[PDB]
Amino acid sequence: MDQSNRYANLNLKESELIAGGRHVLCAYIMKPKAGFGNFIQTAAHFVAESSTGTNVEVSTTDDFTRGVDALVYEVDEANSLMKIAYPIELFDRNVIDGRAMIASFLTLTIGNNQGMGDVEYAKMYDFYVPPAYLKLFDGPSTTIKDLWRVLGRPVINGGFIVGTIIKPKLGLRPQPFANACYDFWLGGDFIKNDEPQGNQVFAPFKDTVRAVADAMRRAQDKTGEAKLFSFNITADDHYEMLARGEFILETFADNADHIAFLVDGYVAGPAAVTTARRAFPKQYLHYHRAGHGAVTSPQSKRGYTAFVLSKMARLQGASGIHTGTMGFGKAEGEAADRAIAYMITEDAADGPYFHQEWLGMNPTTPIISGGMNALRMPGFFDNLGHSNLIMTAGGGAFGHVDGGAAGAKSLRQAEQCWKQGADPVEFAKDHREFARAFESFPQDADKLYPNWRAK
Amino acid sequence: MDQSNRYANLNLKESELIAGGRHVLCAYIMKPKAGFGNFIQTAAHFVAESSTGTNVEVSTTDDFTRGVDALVYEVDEANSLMKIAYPIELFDRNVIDGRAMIASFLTLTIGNNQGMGDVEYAKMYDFYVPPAYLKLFDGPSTTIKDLWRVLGRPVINGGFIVGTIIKPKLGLRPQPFANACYDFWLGGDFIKNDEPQGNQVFAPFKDTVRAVADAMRRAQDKTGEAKLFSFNITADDHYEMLARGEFILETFADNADHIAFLVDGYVAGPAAVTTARRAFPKQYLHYHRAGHGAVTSPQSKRGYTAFVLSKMARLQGASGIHTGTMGFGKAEGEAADRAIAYMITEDAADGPYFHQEWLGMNPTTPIISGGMNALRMPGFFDNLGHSNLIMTAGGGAFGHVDGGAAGAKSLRQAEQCWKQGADPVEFAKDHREFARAFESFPQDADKLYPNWRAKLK
Amino acid sequence: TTIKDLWRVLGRPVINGGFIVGTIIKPKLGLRPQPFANACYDFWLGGDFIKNDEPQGNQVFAPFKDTVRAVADAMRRAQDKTGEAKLFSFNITADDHYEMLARGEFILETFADNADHIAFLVDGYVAGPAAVTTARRAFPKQYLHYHRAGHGAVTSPQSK
Numbered sequence A: 001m002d003q004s005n006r007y008a009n010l011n012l013k014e015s016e017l018i019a020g021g022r023h024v025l026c027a028y029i030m031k032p033k034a035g036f037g038n039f040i041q042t043a044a045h046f047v048a049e050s051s052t053g054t055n056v057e058v059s060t061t062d063d064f065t066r067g068v069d070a071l072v073y074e075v076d077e078a079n080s081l082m083k084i085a086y087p088i089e090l091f092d093r094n095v096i097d098g099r100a101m102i103a104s105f106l107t108l109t110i111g112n113n114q115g116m117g118d119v120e121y122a123k124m125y126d127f128y129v130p131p132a133y134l135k136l137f138d139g140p141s142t143t144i145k146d147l148w149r150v151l152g153r154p155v156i157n158g159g160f161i162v163g164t165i166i167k168p169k170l171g172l173r174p175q176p177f178a179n180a181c182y183d184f185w186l187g188g189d190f191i192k193n194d195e196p197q198g199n200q201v202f203a204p205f206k207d208t209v210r211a212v213a214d215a216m217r218r219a220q221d222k223t224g225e226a227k228l229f230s231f232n233i234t235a236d237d238h239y240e241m242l243a244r245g246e247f248i249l250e251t252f253a254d255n256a257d258h259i260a261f262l263v264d265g266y267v268a269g270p271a272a273v274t275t276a277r278r279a280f281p282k283q284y285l286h287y288h289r290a291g292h293g294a295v296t297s298p299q300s301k302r303g304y305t306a307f308v309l310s311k312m313a314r315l316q317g318a319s320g321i322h323t324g325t326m327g328f329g330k331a332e333g334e335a336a337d338r339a340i341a342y343m344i345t346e347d348a349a350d351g352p353y354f355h356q357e358w359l360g361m362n363p364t365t366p367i368i369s370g371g372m373n374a375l376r377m378p379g380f381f382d383n384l385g386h387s388n389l390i391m392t393a394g395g396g397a398f399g400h401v402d403g404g405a406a407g408a409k410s411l412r413q414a415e416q417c418w419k420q421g422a423d424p425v426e427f428a429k430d431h432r433e434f435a436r437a438f439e440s441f442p443q444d445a446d447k448l449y450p451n452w453r454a455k
Numbered sequence B: 001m002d003q004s005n006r007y008a009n010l011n012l013k014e015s016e017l018i019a020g021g022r023h024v025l026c027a028y029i030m031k032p033k034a035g036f037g038n039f040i041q042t043a044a045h046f047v048a049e050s051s052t053g054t055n056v057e058v059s060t061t062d063d064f065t066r067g068v069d070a071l072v073y074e075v076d077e078a079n080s081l082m083k084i085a086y087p088i089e090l091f092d093r094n095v096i097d098g099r100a101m102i103a104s105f106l107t108l109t110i111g112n113n114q115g116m117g118d119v120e121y122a123k124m125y126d127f128y129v130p131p132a133y134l135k136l137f138d139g140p141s142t143t144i145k146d147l148w149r150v151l152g153r154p155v156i157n158g159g160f161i162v163g164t165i166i167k168p169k170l171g172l173r174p175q176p177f178a179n180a181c182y183d184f185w186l187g188g189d190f191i192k193n194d195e196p197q198g199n200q201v202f203a204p205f206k207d208t209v210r211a212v213a214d215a216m217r218r219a220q221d222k223t224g225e226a227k228l229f230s231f232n233i234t235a236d237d238h239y240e241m242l243a244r245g246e247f248i249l250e251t252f253a254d255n256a257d258h259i260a261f262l263v264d265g266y267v268a269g270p271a272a273v274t275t276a277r278r279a280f281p282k283q284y285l286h287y288h289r290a291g292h293g294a295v296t297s298p299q300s301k302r303g304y305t306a307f308v309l310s311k312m313a314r315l316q317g318a319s320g321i322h323t324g325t326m327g328f329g330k331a332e333g334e335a336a337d338r339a340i341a342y343m344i345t346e347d348a349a350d351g352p353y354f355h356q357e358w359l360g361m362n363p364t365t366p367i368i369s370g371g372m373n374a375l376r377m378p379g380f381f382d383n384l385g386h387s388n389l390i391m392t393a394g395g396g397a398f399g400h401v402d403g404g405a406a407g408a409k410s411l412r413q414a415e416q417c418w419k420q421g422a423d424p425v426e427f428a429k430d431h432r433e434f435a436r437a438f439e440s441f442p443q444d445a446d447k448l449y450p451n452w453r454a455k456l457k
Numbered sequence C: 001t002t003i004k005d006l007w008r009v010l011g012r013p014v015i016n017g018g019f020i021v022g023t024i025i026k027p028k029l030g031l032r033p034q035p036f037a038n039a040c041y042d043f044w045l046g047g048d049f050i051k052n053d054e055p056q057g058n059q060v061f062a063p064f065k066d067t068v069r070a071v072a073d074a075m076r077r078a079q080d081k082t083g084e085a086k087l088f089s090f091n092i093t094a095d096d097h098y099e100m101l102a103r104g105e106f107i108l109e110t111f112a113d114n115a116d117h118i119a120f121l122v123d124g125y126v127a128g129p130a131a132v133t134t135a136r137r138a139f140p141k142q143y144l145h146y147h148r149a150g151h152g153a154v155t156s157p158q159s160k
């Protein structure tokens, strides 16, 4: 049944909808399935299933309901483009504090409409949130500044935070785990649990946290420098997350503010992210996005993009989120992904379709990870334009021929090489650890630098 | 770099892995991306990124780590098949009660491996959980039995629960909302919040809960029959969910056991499902899967299938989950989806690759929804084989020409027609509400029944 | 929770899983933490199930947490020795609702991966239904073991 006359108003202007500040805008790449309605008809049903309607008319509908209908206000069949305007009154609010929830946003904009039989596929590429709705989100409470302050760095442009992931992903018992932490910290700043590390039977949570706490104290006493750790506290059970978080902070004691909390936000869900954000607002919230690739991949024409996921995470209150290597690492990513970083860091930025004013909402740090090492870093920073971020290199550090500590220093020197604007191969002649990264990863060295070995 | 020698052991036999009861098995349909390694090489890296390794060798690796490596134990490149065995020691456990978490299962089996550059796509179609890992999951604490008991039905095979969704999806104010609830309950049993309904500014949560609570009392007093309602309590904030849930139960008072709690488990995540499951174990947990289509659709070759999503939901403790209309409704689905229903309801069932014993773990109700009406119901039931379930028809009920109450009765009579094995058109001549469903949805009636008008009016 | 859940842990059929061999640690009171745990290990070499005698808890000569830790170790040792699963029923009876939570919560964390091997015993007749309900609602996933000490005062045929 055709509901275009109700759910479609292409005479509406995007500029006025933004100026109004009473609508969330979303931009989709949608394709109707063969044997049903044309583009606007299918788009109309899409809007219905995403706001106020269903697949048939019902007597219970009144004029007030019609007033809050979402509306397709712009379409371009030749590019499969479909823009929809959602009145902000549609989105659910907390009874307890009147604040917004991303779960309601997801349910309407990217929920049931992903299972429509008359649609072949549809994927959100961008969305706009007006001021009245934006200010109702938590936003980040801790930022990279709080990490800079702990490291004794300038709170403004404090610079690059050298990081790694403890590898193997799983298998290290408590003390072997802590030993690797100590080694890396002799040359680096930051360490995160690999995403699945927690309370495995061969590496009990409390024993590992205790061993790492010891390793931090030993490393700090040895180097005279502050060291950071990001603990995975992900769990199905809200109270398990609290239990883990509380034990960590008590255990680390005077080093409690050296701690970040990692949450697998995509698989555990927004509910888990909000648990950490609200229970531990004074601890850096580290959003790990494992599993996101199922929808965000360009290979997928469903769900939403990495850009959308990142923008949402900032609203949820992620202190930092993985944004990818932007084509310079091992995972799917493009140089154009730099736009994602700007969107989560700046107070004003452009998306693929919408300009977003953030109204002083705190930034989310772009966390760079995925097959990175000292050799690949200069190219990466060139594409982004800055190094005010956290970069973790698991294999890149612990895969160094001279050990984790040397690996750490190679990452440090790689960024110093870019900041000096020096040539990597020439730079290497005065920095062994960086030069030794060439021998550690000769295939990367051969591709990135053609004749590094002779020179 | 090639890691086949470490992460691949094709000499392992599946029967031994199952008999051992120390491995979670997963079956994927994977395709390597062009310009990298062959199938087994790509499969090896996939396993590494899904268990103990990364894209390069590291000095920190010891033999104990190698002892817990996941392993590719079966492949079929001509069919793009890849089976992986995960040692159960890899999966995270709660510090507080030593129980399992689905979040850890997802992180390893379907996490980082979905973003691999050397893989074009990979999708989980089935998984096996041994007893030692299975018993560590919550499982459902409430089942349809408890809804049957309230309705005064037999607790075993209590039969069909006539349901609907309040439509419009959003827009009804508290009392107009409650009025629609009263109308439907005159002929039906069950009503659920549409998935986004909650605390909208035009329909305050507490005002609506109070209005619906009043409507239930009026409808039950009117019909002398018990009536059920499923409230959406989804929220980012764990404490918001508790606040909503606690207010509902107190408000309904002596009808508190008539209440189910709906959670948008896919978009809100397992954390939200577990909050409801553990805070309110005595209330029927209604898992709404909105958004699942992004990965479960056959159009997608990433993530996991609807079968996997449903199987996980049983472990998480869903009292019921939407399983789709199996090709008979408005959403993407196939007739073969009946197998999903069997997997979540039976104590033993076969998946696309693995046989699963549930060891007495409680069943999860298949909740049928999505463009269903009285006309489409007989066909759906024929494919499934039973009607011991909940079916909700929003448009099918409130889209009835004679109103929501008539709509309810049409759904009731439609199911009565299938169990009696009667001819729908002939059945209609003695059942008005069912007959009026033809005139309500003539397009469906014309295709499903060719000359109903001649046989009726 | 039912016997089905105990059968599942023991690796028995969940339907008609059969006889669960059990005992009570004797002396009723007097055993210090390690001698207590030693008796647990001994019995578990041939049996499945062990319950605290009804008054055993936090006596000054057998601190609760010290004993819980010792039994947990004994369970691991017994299970490693026999390759068989072992069950224990801890008395968590108390006047104070929050004491019951404290005992139960400490036990489950301590036993960790063996947490589902634990049953909770409550002296339901003398402590009352309130204590039974505390355990039932706080720990629905743990086998609730109702001990009826004192019941004889009214239930005895001698009493009318």
Ligand SMILES: O=C(O)[C@@](O)(COP(=O)(O)O)[C@H](O)[C@H](O)COP(=O)(O)O
Pocket (backbone or CB within 6 Å): A165, A167, A194, A195, A289, A290, A322, A323, A324, A325, A330, A331, A368, A369, A370, A371, A372, A392, A393, A394, A395, A396, B049, B054, B055, B112, B115
């Ligand atoms: O498990 C891993 O692979 C990593 O620890 C990187 O390890 P390596 O440094 O050894 O590659 C990260 O979790 C991924 O980068 C996540 O991907 P993303 O940031 O794109 O979400």
Ligand SMILES: O=C(O)[C@@](O)(COP(=O)(O)O)[C@H](O)[C@H](O)COP(=O)(O)O
Pocket (backbone or CB within 6 Å): A049, A054, A055, A112, A115, B165, B167, B194, B195, B289, B290, B322, B323, B324, B325, B330, B331, B367, B368, B369, B370, B371, B372, B392, B393, B394, B395, B396
């Ligand atoms: O919002 C809706 O469209 C529904 O209320 C159906 O309404 P109608 O009865 O009016 O069609 C259900 O939430 C969908 O069935 C969900 O799909 P699924 O069950 O496949 O997850």
Ligand SMILES: [Mg+2]
Pocket (backbone or CB within 6 Å): A165, A193, A194, A195
């Ligand atoms: Mg990782």
Ligand SMILES: [Mg+2]
Pocket (backbone or CB within 6 Å): B165, B193, B194, B195
């Ligand atoms: Mg719905």
Ligand SMILES: [Mg+2]
Pocket (backbone or CB within 6 Å): C024, C052, C053, C054
């Ligand atoms: Mg006794």
